[PDB]
Design a protein around this ligand. Structure first.
Ligand code: IPV
Length: 289
């Protein structure tokens, strides 16, 4: 809390931003829409409430890692404020919503799946080069722009590796997206996010990650004992797509591809413009309406 107090900005956020309009809830807190009074840029603010914050060290890590690792494929952090018992986190606004709404309500073609994977891999190649392991890659941590921009968010679970203390060993993430080495409690590397991306590609195909009908503990045991998840209907996908997924979901960490390596895959060469994701966004919004 003392370290937290010395990260936040000076000044009234209520007097710096106006046109506040609630666009969601509510795990970590309320999400509002706003407009910068001086610039006119449209911003997205999350009101946290520190009483519902369990670890707290997480909130500082999220803020610090977002700050130090700015890239076109990472939701652009603006500023933070502590009004009174509440923590306000100001970011660029991505009105397109989350990938979750797209994967759960729409059927994505191979060219669109490829486009998202490419952008997601660009975010990962950036973080892994800066020795940052995201650890919670899943459709829910992908925000879309109205133009079709793909941006990575939620850095609360991330780990900073060093040539001295790398790999990592703590069972962190969301069960259904976790790599077998994470679940089994082995020392793991950045390639855990690659596995999480393969699961997110399965979401894009099937609408949900393997074992979602199960309870998280069962899923942990199913990822541990079964490994590489089998698809409902593999025959529906192309060979180059079937290959991209095998490289993402390989049990052998050394065999599993890096973001640098997967960015060169034949699959991403069939990727469509990001404007091809705008009819998906339009359908998701109509479906969840
Ligand atoms: C304010 C914020 C701060 C820090 C971080 C880092 O964790 C993320 C954000 N968020 C969640 C952002 C950032 C930029 N843009 C958006 N856009 C957006 C979010 C939502 N949700 C709110 C409820 O929970 C799920 C996400 C809904 C819609 S929509 C469908 O109404 O157009 C748009 N949200």
């Amino acid at each position: 809390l003392e370290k937290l107090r010395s990260i936040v900005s000076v000044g009234d956020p209520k007097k710096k931003y106006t046109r506040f309009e609630k666009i969601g809830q509510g795990a970590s807190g309320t999400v509002y829409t706003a407009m910068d009074v001086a610039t006119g840029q449209e911003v997205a603010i999350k009101q946290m409430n520190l009483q519902q914050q369990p670890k707290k060290e997480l909130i500082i890590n999220e803020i610090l890692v977002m700050r130090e690792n700015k890239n076109p494929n990472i939701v652009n952090y603006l500023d933070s404020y502590l009004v009174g018992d509440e923590l306000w986190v100001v970011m660029e606004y991505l009105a397109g919503g989350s990938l979750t709404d797209v994967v759960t309500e729409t059927c994505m073609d191979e060219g669109q799946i490829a486009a998202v994977c490419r952008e997601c891999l660009q975010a990962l190649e950036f973080l892994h080069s800066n020795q940052v392991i995201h650890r919670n890659i899943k459709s829910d941590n992908i925000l879309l722009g109205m133009d079709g921009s793909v941006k990575l968010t939620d850095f609360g679970f991330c780990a900073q590796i060093t040539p001295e203390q790398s790999k990592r060993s703590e069972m962190v993430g969301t069960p259904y997206w976790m790599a077998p080495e994470v679940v089994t409690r082995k020392a793991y590397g950045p390639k855990v996010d690659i596995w999480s991306l393969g699961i997110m590609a399965i979401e894009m195909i099937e609408g949900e990650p393997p074992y979602l009908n199960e309870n998280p503990l069962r899923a942990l045991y199913l990822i541990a004992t079964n490994g590489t998840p089998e698809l409902q209907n593999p025959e529906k996908l192309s060979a180059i797509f079937r290959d991209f997924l095998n490289r993402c979901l390989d049990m052998d960490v050394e065999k599993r591809g890096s973001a640098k390596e997967l960015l060169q895959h034949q699959f991403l060469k069939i990727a469509k413009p990001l404007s091809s994701l705008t009819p998906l966004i339009a359908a998701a919004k109509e479906a969840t309406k």
